[PDB]
Design a protein around this ligand. Structure first.
Ligand code: HEM
Length: 293
């Protein structure tokens, strides 16, 4: 048994309307550049898009991006989501200016906007997520643990209908931002260019000299002398021979990584949603830079 969630376009809206929302997000990203010691809000908005989508369960179609349920306190206060309140606060003035967009559409568009504005690939995006009631909020515990191994990771993502290539591609988002000890019990960035979307995550996995250390929360993480870290689950991508081949591919082919990430990220954001056959095609938003804005 699975619920059906049919996409329904916000009434009367079309590409131009959502490009305006895109633009407002992008301009605020530019404006509020001081966030997180000048990393900016790009990374936390990408994380917010993933965590609001990553509760999905293919078996019964519970969770997922459609209902926008992070706005309800059970999901907002998931310990897995610690730190994401910053993303939500960023989006509040956006939602205030454009109150017609659904919460799910906003959270997922925030992630697309962030990736593109950080020079990542275009991510086609579809509208029509519809807010669902508080009792549809999925319980805590559907997001993954970081202390585990490759078998955990593989098994975890089966629940989101992601294969090895999809998983390795999605994990490349760890180029962005950092772990924060008070949020997750891990500390440090994965790389140097952490508000520009690149394939740095894979290059660092393969080329840094990693040491297994304990951080100040008494948790193990892999650290390099350049001041970078990897979670146990990140490092698992080079411990497993199947993941390791894919890491090598993306480390050696920027374009391939961009294309595969774009597909997997859109899929993650669309899991659980039925698009009517007459739905609009996916939108590909222009960046501020492409618009001369
Ligand atoms: C095994 C799967 C994953 C695990 C265990 C995991 C774990 C974590 C942890 C522990 C943090 C640090 C949070 C903090 O302390 O602030 C984090 C941050 C982050 N995650 Fe992942 N993650 C996974 C997959 C993903 C995926 C699939 C994406 C997106 C496609 C993603 C995007 C990010 C981003 C952008 C940040 C940085 C946020 C910031 O700097 O505020 N993660 N993740």
């Amino acid at each position: 048994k699975t619920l059906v969630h049919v996409a329904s376009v916000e009434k009367g809206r079309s590409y131009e309307d959502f490009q305006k929302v895109y633009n407002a997000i992008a301009l605020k990203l530019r404006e509020d550049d001081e966030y997180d010691n000048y990393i900016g809000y790009g990374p936390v908005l990408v994380r917010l898009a993933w965590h609001t989508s990553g509760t999905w369960d293919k078996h019964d179609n519970t969770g997922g991006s459609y209902g926008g349920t992070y706005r309800f306190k059970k999901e907002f206060n998931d310990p897995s989501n610690a730190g994401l309140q910053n993303g939500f606060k960023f989006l509040e003035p956006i939602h205030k200016e454009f109150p017609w967009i659904s919460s799910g559409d906003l959270f997922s568009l925030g992630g697309v906007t962030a990736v593109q504005e950080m020079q990542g690939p275009k991510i086609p995006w579809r509208c029509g997520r519809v807010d669902t009631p508080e009792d549809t909020t999925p319980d805590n515990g559907r997001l993954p643990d970081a202390d585990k191994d490759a078998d955990y990771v593989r098994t975890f993502f089966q629940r989101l209908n992601m294969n090895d290539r999809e998983v390795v591609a999605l994990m490349g988002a760890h180029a962005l931002g950092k772990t924060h000890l008070k949020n997750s019990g891990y500390e440090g960035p994965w790389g140097a260019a952490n508000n520009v979307f690149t394939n740095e995550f894979y290059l660092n996995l393969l080329n840094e000299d990693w040491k297994l250390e304990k951080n100040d929360a008494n948790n193990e993480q892999w650290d390099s002398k350049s001041g970078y870290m990897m979670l146990p689950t990140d490092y698992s991508l080079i411990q497993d021979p199947k993941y390791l081949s894919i890491v090598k591919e993306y480390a050696n082919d920027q374009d391939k990584f961009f294309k595969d990430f774009s597909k997997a990220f859109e899929k993650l954001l669309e899991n659980g949603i039925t698009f009517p056959k007459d739905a609009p095609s996916p939108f590909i938003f222009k960046t501020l830079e492409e618009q001369g804005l």
